[PDB]
Structures are given as structure tokens and as C-alpha cells.
Amino acid sequence: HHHGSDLGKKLLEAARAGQDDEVRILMANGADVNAADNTGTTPLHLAAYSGHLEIVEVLLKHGADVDASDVFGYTPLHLAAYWGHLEIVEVLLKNGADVNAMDSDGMTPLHLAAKWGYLEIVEVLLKHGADVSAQDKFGKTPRDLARDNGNEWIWKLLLDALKYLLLEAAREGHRDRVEKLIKAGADVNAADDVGVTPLHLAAQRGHLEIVEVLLKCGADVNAADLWGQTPLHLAATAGHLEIVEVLLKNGADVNARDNIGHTPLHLAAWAGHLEIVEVLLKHGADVNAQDKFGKTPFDLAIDNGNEDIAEVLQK
């Protein structure tokens, strides 16, 4: 006998034709929701492609395999993303779909959403852990596919938004957001119009945890803003000694000059952070450095009455 096979075929065709009620009557009368045609296409594939959200939901509640792949390796999530069905994308992810499934060519759902500039879908995929730098067997990334189809400006908008959010998270000290943004593709070395990078902000506002994360992820420890200030300049001014150390342990230049000629020692002796001076001195800070006014860090320590600092600098 072959009643089960007969029901499966009728279900596939009812789904292929967008006959929601016919699909659900067949299901109610025993049709196998995990049936598949010659190409491995299942009913869930067809509902995800056609955008029939109600059918996607009931199929999943009836045990449809959310990650079923056809002969080319497409899952329902691949189709939902390629054909621009945001709600279905969200439902499949809620039901355990592999966000980073690969087809035979190695393309992920994020590849396909990026290709058409479906920004809302791109962002949900990244929120669920989509591999932002994934490459297919030919080395093409989601950004590459967007550019090839004239949608690069939409990917640049994504990156601009991630850049804004990373700077905000680094300035406000939100460790968890920083990590999730970096993993979603945020450029750790992005800078605003005045050359301030996330590391500048974290070091200035005293967010040690984020300084370590940014450096581990490749932030330039000696990046200079518009005024020539490195993160060590700002940390020395604000008085964050643990950050001063970390920056030095990661290769910060102790004698970096801003535009006025100030080294971190100029700024620390001025600010009155004695131990910072001692750490800088221990790390080879040049006590003889003169700024644009010909003044040394010793000259600045006097002008602030930090005789303890002006005494150790003498030694």
C-alpha cells in the first residue's frame, strides 16, 4: 500500500500552490509534514519561499524539520531570507533554525539577505549569531554579495550603525554590548569625525573591562585623534592607572606627542597622578621632553603644586 506516500505528494502540491486550507485539511487527515519531493523540497521550504507565514507556524507545531535541506543545501531559513520574508525568518529562528547553515556553495542566509539589501533581515540574523565574515567556497562575504548587486550602501549603513553603537557602548561602559557588537561586525578601529575611537572613549571614561576586550580584538593602542591624543594621553589625564598599565603592557608608546607636544608624562604630572608618573617613568617616560611652550613635565608639576611629583621627576 501507499496511502502515506499519496498524502505526502498531495501536501507538497497544496503547499506549492499556496492552498493553506487544503494544506491544513491534509495535515489533519494524516499527511506527513516532513514529506519531500524529488529535489528534497519539503512543505516548510515551500511555505517559507511563498511567504505563507500561517503555514510555516502550523508545520513547525506539527514537527516539521526546521533545518531540512534540499539537494542544493537550502534550508527554509535560506529561502525566507532570499525572498525577503522577515516574519518567517524570525519564526524559523525562534524554532531553532541554524542561523549559519550553508548551501552547496557555502552561502548562509546572511549572504542571501545581504545580496538584496534586506536590512531588517540582516539585523535579525546578526542578532541571532549570524557569521558576519563567512565566506562561500569562492571567498565571497555577505558584504561582497551586497556590493556585487548594487546594495553596498545598505551594508555601509549597517556598519555606520554598528560604529555608532560601539562608540556609545564603549563610552557608557556596557561590556556585554561591546562584545556582541564586535561579534556582529563592528569595526573596533572605527573613529568619529574627530578621530576618537572606541578605545579612546573606554580609556578616557575608565572602563578597564572594555579596554581589555578592544585590545584583544585588535584595537590600535596608539591610535591618535584629531588633536594627536592617544588613549594613553587621555587615560593619563583622567587618572585611570590600571588602564595606563594595560595600555603600556599592550604596547602603547609612553612618549607619544599630541599636537601641543605633550607626552603622557606632561599630562600626568600636571593632573597630579603620582603613581601614573611612577609607572610612566618606570616604563621609560622622557623627563626632558619639552612641549610646544618649551615646558617640561617638571615645569607642569610646579604649576600645579605637585611637589611630590616634581621631586621624583628631579631624581
Short mmCIF file of C-alpha atoms in Angstrom, two decimals:
data_model
loop_
_atom_site.label_atom_id
_atom_site.label_comp_id
_atom_site.label_asym_id
_atom_site.label_seq_id
_atom_site.Cartn_x
_atom_site.Cartn_y
_atom_site.Cartn_z
CA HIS A 1 0.00 0.00 0.00
CA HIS A 2 0.97 3.65 -0.43
CA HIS A 3 -1.56 5.89 1.34
CA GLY A 4 1.16 7.77 3.22
CA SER A 5 3.07 8.45 0.01
CA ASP A 6 -0.13 9.67 -1.65
CA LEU A 7 -0.83 12.12 1.20
CA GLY A 8 2.72 13.47 1.12
CA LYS A 9 2.51 14.29 -2.58
CA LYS A 10 -0.86 16.00 -2.19
CA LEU A 11 0.51 18.02 0.73
CA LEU A 12 3.54 19.17 -1.26
CA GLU A 13 1.33 20.30 -4.15
CA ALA A 14 -1.16 22.04 -1.86
CA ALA A 15 1.80 23.89 -0.34
CA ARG A 16 3.39 24.60 -3.72
CA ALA A 17 0.08 26.14 -4.86
CA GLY A 18 -0.46 28.22 -1.71
CA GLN A 19 -3.64 26.35 -0.69
CA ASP A 20 -3.45 26.99 3.05
CA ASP A 21 -6.78 25.42 3.98
CA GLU A 22 -6.13 22.41 1.74
CA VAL A 23 -2.72 22.04 3.38
CA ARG A 24 -4.27 22.03 6.85
CA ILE A 25 -7.05 19.60 5.93
CA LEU A 26 -4.48 17.16 4.56
CA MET A 27 -2.40 17.55 7.73
CA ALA A 28 -5.49 16.98 9.87
CA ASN A 29 -6.13 13.76 7.91
CA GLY A 30 -2.63 12.35 8.38
CA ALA A 31 -0.39 13.95 5.75
CA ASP A 32 3.30 13.75 6.68
CA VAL A 33 4.58 17.29 7.26
CA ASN A 34 8.15 16.07 6.64
CA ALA A 35 7.43 14.79 3.12
CA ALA A 36 9.85 15.79 0.37
CA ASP A 37 9.78 15.84 -3.42
CA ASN A 38 12.47 14.78 -5.90
CA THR A 39 14.60 17.85 -5.10
CA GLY A 40 14.41 17.49 -1.31
CA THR A 41 11.89 20.32 -1.10
CA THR A 42 9.59 19.93 1.91
CA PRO A 43 6.33 21.75 2.68
CA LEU A 44 8.22 24.05 5.05
CA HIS A 45 10.55 25.08 2.21
CA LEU A 46 7.54 25.95 0.05
CA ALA A 47 5.76 27.92 2.77
CA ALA A 48 8.95 29.83 3.60
CA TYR A 49 9.57 30.64 -0.07
CA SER A 50 5.99 31.75 -0.79
CA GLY A 51 5.71 33.80 2.40
CA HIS A 52 2.78 31.81 3.85
CA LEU A 53 3.52 32.57 7.49
CA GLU A 54 0.45 30.83 8.94
CA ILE A 55 1.50 27.58 7.24
CA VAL A 56 5.09 27.91 8.48
CA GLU A 57 3.77 28.15 12.04
CA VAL A 58 1.46 25.12 11.88
CA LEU A 59 4.04 22.99 10.08
CA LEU A 60 6.55 23.69 12.85
CA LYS A 61 3.96 22.90 15.53
CA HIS A 62 3.39 19.57 13.75
CA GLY A 63 7.06 18.59 13.91
CA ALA A 64 8.37 19.84 10.56
CA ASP A 65 12.17 19.72 10.44
CA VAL A 66 13.21 23.37 10.63
CA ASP A 67 16.68 22.65 9.15
CA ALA A 68 15.65 20.32 6.31
CA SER A 69 17.93 20.93 3.33
CA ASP A 70 17.13 20.32 -0.33
CA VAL A 71 19.52 18.91 -2.96
CA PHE A 72 21.31 22.27 -3.21
CA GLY A 73 21.57 22.63 0.58
CA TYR A 74 18.89 25.31 1.03
CA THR A 75 17.05 25.31 4.35
CA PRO A 76 13.76 27.15 4.92
CA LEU A 77 15.77 29.97 6.51
CA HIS A 78 17.80 30.34 3.30
CA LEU A 79 14.55 30.81 1.36
CA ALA A 80 12.87 33.13 3.87
CA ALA A 81 15.94 35.38 3.72
CA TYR A 82 16.44 35.22 -0.05
CA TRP A 83 12.78 36.03 -0.73
CA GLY A 84 12.55 38.74 1.93
CA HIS A 85 10.06 37.30 4.45
CA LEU A 86 11.08 38.91 7.75
CA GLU A 87 8.39 37.40 9.98
CA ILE A 88 9.10 33.88 8.70
CA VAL A 89 12.83 34.48 9.29
CA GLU A 90 12.01 35.35 12.90
CA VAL A 91 9.73 32.34 13.38
CA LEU A 92 12.27 29.86 12.00
CA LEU A 93 14.96 31.29 14.29
CA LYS A 94 12.59 31.09 17.27
CA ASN A 95 12.09 27.39 16.43
CA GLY A 96 15.80 26.54 16.41
CA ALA A 97 16.85 27.12 12.80
CA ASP A 98 20.61 27.01 12.19
CA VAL A 99 21.38 30.68 11.58
CA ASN A 100 24.65 29.78 9.83
CA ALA A 101 23.54 26.83 7.68
CA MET A 102 25.45 26.54 4.40
CA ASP A 103 24.21 25.53 0.97
CA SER A 104 26.32 23.54 -1.50
CA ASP A 105 28.18 26.73 -2.48
CA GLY A 106 28.79 27.69 1.16
CA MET A 107 26.36 30.61 1.31
CA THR A 108 24.49 31.33 4.54
CA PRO A 109 21.12 33.04 4.99
CA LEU A 110 23.02 36.24 5.79
CA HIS A 111 24.71 36.03 2.38
CA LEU A 112 21.30 35.92 0.71
CA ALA A 113 19.70 38.69 2.77
CA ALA A 114 22.72 40.93 2.22
CA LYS A 115 22.56 40.33 -1.54
CA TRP A 116 19.14 42.00 -1.83
CA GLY A 117 19.75 44.67 0.82
CA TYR A 118 17.10 43.33 3.22
CA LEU A 119 18.49 45.28 6.16
CA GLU A 120 15.86 44.26 8.72
CA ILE A 121 16.56 40.58 7.97
CA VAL A 122 20.33 41.15 8.05
CA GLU A 123 19.98 42.65 11.53
CA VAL A 124 17.82 39.84 12.94
CA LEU A 125 20.26 37.27 11.57
CA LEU A 126 23.19 39.07 13.21
CA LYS A 127 21.21 39.38 16.45
CA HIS A 128 20.88 35.57 16.44
CA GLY A 129 24.59 35.00 15.82
CA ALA A 130 24.93 35.16 12.03
CA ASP A 131 28.54 34.81 10.88
CA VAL A 132 29.21 38.31 9.55
CA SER A 133 32.51 37.41 7.84
CA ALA A 134 31.50 33.98 6.49
CA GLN A 135 32.91 33.19 3.04
CA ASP A 136 31.45 30.83 0.47
CA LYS A 137 33.62 28.37 -1.45
CA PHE A 138 34.64 31.27 -3.72
CA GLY A 139 35.62 33.63 -0.89
CA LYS A 140 32.59 35.93 -1.14
CA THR A 141 31.31 37.51 2.08
CA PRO A 142 27.83 38.92 2.66
CA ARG A 143 29.32 42.38 2.03
CA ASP A 144 30.80 41.14 -1.27
CA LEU A 145 27.40 39.89 -2.45
CA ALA A 146 25.70 43.15 -1.47
CA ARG A 147 28.27 45.14 -3.45
CA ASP A 148 28.02 42.87 -6.49
CA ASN A 149 24.26 43.53 -6.63
CA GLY A 150 24.42 47.30 -6.08
CA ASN A 151 23.45 47.14 -2.40
CA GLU A 152 26.75 48.12 -0.77
CA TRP A 153 25.31 51.39 0.52
CA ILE A 154 22.88 49.34 2.62
CA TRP A 155 25.75 47.33 4.12
CA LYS A 156 27.59 50.59 4.79
CA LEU A 157 24.51 51.79 6.68
CA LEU A 158 24.73 48.65 8.82
CA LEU A 159 28.40 49.34 9.54
CA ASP A 160 27.69 53.00 10.29
CA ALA A 161 25.01 51.96 12.78
CA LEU A 162 27.32 49.40 14.40
CA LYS A 163 30.02 52.07 14.57
CA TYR A 164 27.67 54.47 16.34
CA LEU A 165 26.56 51.78 18.79
CA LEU A 166 30.10 50.57 19.55
CA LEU A 167 31.26 54.11 20.34
CA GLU A 168 28.23 54.59 22.61
CA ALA A 169 28.74 51.26 24.38
CA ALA A 170 32.45 51.94 24.83
CA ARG A 171 31.77 55.44 26.17
CA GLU A 172 28.99 54.31 28.53
CA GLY A 173 30.80 51.16 29.68
CA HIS A 174 28.49 48.36 28.52
CA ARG A 175 30.81 45.35 28.31
CA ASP A 176 28.18 42.92 27.04
CA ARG A 177 27.01 45.24 24.26
CA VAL A 178 30.61 45.88 23.15
CA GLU A 179 31.27 42.15 22.76
CA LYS A 180 28.03 41.48 20.89
CA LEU A 181 28.67 44.45 18.58
CA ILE A 182 32.24 43.33 17.84
CA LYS A 183 30.98 39.83 17.02
CA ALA A 184 28.27 41.27 14.75
CA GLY A 185 30.88 43.07 12.63
CA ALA A 186 31.55 46.41 14.33
CA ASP A 187 34.92 47.86 13.31
CA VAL A 188 36.90 48.05 16.56
CA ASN A 189 39.10 50.72 14.94
CA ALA A 190 36.26 52.93 13.70
CA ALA A 191 36.56 56.63 14.51
CA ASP A 192 34.16 59.57 14.59
CA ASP A 193 34.69 62.89 12.79
CA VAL A 194 37.30 63.99 15.37
CA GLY A 195 39.29 60.74 15.20
CA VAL A 196 38.06 59.35 18.54
CA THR A 197 37.90 55.54 18.57
CA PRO A 198 36.12 53.20 20.99
CA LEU A 199 39.46 52.66 22.75
CA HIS A 200 39.88 56.42 23.25
CA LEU A 201 36.45 56.52 24.87
CA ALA A 202 36.91 53.46 27.09
CA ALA A 203 40.33 54.65 28.27
CA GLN A 204 39.10 58.19 28.99
CA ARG A 205 35.93 57.14 30.84
CA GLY A 206 37.84 54.50 32.82
CA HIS A 207 36.20 51.31 31.53
CA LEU A 208 39.03 48.85 32.13
CA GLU A 209 36.99 45.79 31.13
CA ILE A 210 36.24 47.25 27.68
CA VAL A 211 39.83 48.45 27.15
CA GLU A 212 40.95 44.83 27.51
CA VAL A 213 38.27 43.49 25.15
CA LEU A 214 39.00 46.09 22.47
CA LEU A 215 42.74 45.41 22.63
CA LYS A 216 42.16 41.65 22.49
CA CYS A 217 40.05 42.20 19.35
CA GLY A 218 42.71 44.29 17.60
CA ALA A 219 42.15 47.93 18.59
CA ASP A 220 45.10 50.17 17.75
CA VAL A 221 46.55 51.03 21.16
CA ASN A 222 48.36 54.05 19.65
CA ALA A 223 45.51 55.50 17.58
CA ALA A 224 45.63 59.30 17.54
CA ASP A 225 42.57 61.56 17.36
CA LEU A 226 42.38 64.95 15.64
CA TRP A 227 44.35 66.62 18.45
CA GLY A 228 47.08 63.96 18.38
CA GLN A 229 45.89 62.28 21.58
CA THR A 230 46.32 58.54 22.07
CA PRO A 231 44.31 56.52 24.59
CA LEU A 232 47.28 56.79 26.96
CA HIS A 233 47.19 60.60 26.77
CA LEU A 234 43.52 60.53 27.77
CA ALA A 235 43.97 57.90 30.49
CA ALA A 236 46.91 59.84 31.93
CA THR A 237 44.79 62.99 32.06
CA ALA A 238 41.75 61.31 33.61
CA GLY A 239 43.88 59.33 36.06
CA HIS A 240 43.00 55.70 35.30
CA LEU A 241 46.13 53.88 36.45
CA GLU A 242 45.10 50.28 35.76
CA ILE A 243 44.24 51.36 32.21
CA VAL A 244 47.59 53.15 31.94
CA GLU A 245 49.25 49.83 32.81
CA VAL A 246 47.17 47.73 30.41
CA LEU A 247 47.83 50.22 27.61
CA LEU A 248 51.56 50.03 28.35
CA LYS A 249 51.53 46.23 28.60
CA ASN A 250 49.85 46.13 25.17
CA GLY A 251 52.48 48.35 23.55
CA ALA A 252 51.36 51.96 24.00
CA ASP A 253 54.10 54.50 23.22
CA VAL A 254 54.98 56.11 26.55
CA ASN A 255 56.45 59.20 24.85
CA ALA A 256 53.74 59.86 22.26
CA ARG A 257 53.28 63.54 21.40
CA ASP A 258 49.92 65.21 20.86
CA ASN A 259 49.70 68.37 18.75
CA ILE A 260 50.77 70.63 21.64
CA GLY A 261 53.82 68.42 22.20
CA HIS A 262 52.56 66.96 25.48
CA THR A 263 53.57 63.43 26.41
CA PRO A 264 51.52 61.31 28.81
CA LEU A 265 54.03 62.44 31.45
CA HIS A 266 53.20 66.10 30.82
CA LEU A 267 49.52 65.29 31.35
CA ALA A 268 50.02 63.06 34.41
CA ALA A 269 52.46 65.29 36.29
CA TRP A 270 50.03 68.12 35.55
CA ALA A 271 46.98 66.12 36.68
CA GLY A 272 48.73 65.09 39.91
CA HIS A 273 48.59 61.31 39.44
CA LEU A 274 51.82 60.35 41.17
CA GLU A 275 51.74 56.58 40.66
CA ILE A 276 50.86 57.15 36.99
CA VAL A 277 54.03 59.25 36.80
CA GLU A 278 55.99 56.47 38.50
CA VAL A 279 54.56 53.86 36.12
CA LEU A 280 55.30 56.11 33.15
CA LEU A 281 58.80 56.80 34.50
CA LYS A 282 59.30 53.08 35.14
CA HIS A 283 58.28 52.50 31.51
CA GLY A 284 60.78 55.00 30.10
CA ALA A 285 58.95 58.33 30.08
CA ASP A 286 61.28 61.13 28.99
CA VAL A 287 61.52 63.68 31.80
CA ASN A 288 63.37 66.07 29.47
CA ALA A 289 60.61 66.24 26.83
CA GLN A 290 59.55 69.82 26.07
CA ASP A 291 56.12 70.70 24.71
CA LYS A 292 55.38 73.48 22.21
CA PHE A 293 55.90 76.02 25.02
CA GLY A 294 59.35 74.64 25.82
CA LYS A 295 58.00 73.42 29.17
CA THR A 296 58.88 70.04 30.67
CA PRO A 297 56.70 67.78 32.82
CA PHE A 298 58.69 69.16 35.75
CA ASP A 299 57.61 72.66 34.70
CA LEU A 300 53.99 71.50 34.74
CA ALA A 301 54.23 69.73 38.10
CA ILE A 302 55.37 73.00 39.68
CA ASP A 303 52.49 74.93 38.09
CA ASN A 304 50.11 72.55 39.90
CA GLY A 305 51.92 72.28 43.24
CA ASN A 306 52.59 68.53 42.93
CA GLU A 307 55.95 68.76 44.66
CA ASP A 308 55.93 65.02 45.36
CA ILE A 309 55.78 64.55 41.59
CA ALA A 310 58.19 67.44 41.00
CA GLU A 311 60.59 65.75 43.44
CA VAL A 312 60.55 62.26 41.91
CA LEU A 313 60.98 63.80 38.46
CA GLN A 314 64.08 65.55 39.81
CA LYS A 315 65.51 62.17 40.82
#
